Swiss-Prot record:
Homotetramer. Can also form heterotetramers with RYR1 and RYR3. Interacts with CALM and S100A1; these interactions regulate channel activity. Identified in a complex composed of RYR2, FKBP1B, PKA catalytic subunit, PRKAR2A, AKAP6, and the protein phosphatases PP2A and PP1. Interacts directly with FKBP1B, PKA, PP1 and PP2A. Interacts with FKBP1A and FKBP1B; these interactions may stabilize the channel in its closed state and prevent Ca(2+) leaks. Interacts with SELENON. Identified in a complex, composed of FSD2, CMYA5 and RYR2. This is Ryanodine receptor 2. It is found in: Sarcoplasmic reticulum membrane. Disruption phenotype: Embryonically lethal. Embryos die at about 10 dpc, due to defects in heart tube development. Cardiac myotubes display enlarged rough endoplasmic reticulum and cytoplasmic vesicles that contain high levels of Ca(2+). Cytosolic calcium-activated calcium channel that mediates the release of Ca(2+) from the sarcoplasmic reticulum into the cytosol and thereby plays a key role in triggering cardiac muscle contraction. Aberrant channel activation can lead to cardiac arrhythmia. In cardiac myocytes, calcium release is triggered by increased Ca(2+) cytosolic levels due to activation of the L-type calcium channel CACNA1C. The calcium channel activity is modulated by formation of heterotetramers with RYR3. Required for cellular calcium ion homeostasis. Required for embryonic heart development. The chain holds residues 3762 to 3809 of 4966 of the full protein. The calcium release channel activity resides in the C-terminal region while the remaining part of the protein resides in the cytoplasm. The lineage of its organism: Eukaryota, Metazoa, Chordata, Craniata, Vertebrata. Highly expressed in heart, lung, cerebellum and brain. Detected at lower levels in adrenal gland, stomach, thymus, esophagus and ovary. Channel activity is modulated by phosphorylation. Phosphorylation is increased in failing heart, leading to calcium leaks and increased cytoplasmic Ca(2+) levels. Belongs to the ryanodine receptor (TC 1.A.3.1) family. RYR2 subfamily.
Length: 48
């Protein structure tokens, strides 16, 4: 977030080029896993 703050096109392009050159499905799989494991509000714990 700190490096990409303001939507720096240079950094965005460098990340895209790195991902394209080094085909890394693991990065997207890790992102999917993180957003799947992100916590949400649960009523049972609040009642406890």
């Amino acid at each position: 977030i700190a490096i990409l703050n303001g939507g720096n096109s240079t950094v965005q392009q460098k990340m895209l080029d790195y991902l394209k050159e080094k085909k890394d499905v693991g990065f997207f799989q890790s992102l999917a896993g993180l957003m799947q494991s992100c916590s949400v509000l649960d009523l049972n714990a609040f009642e406890r």
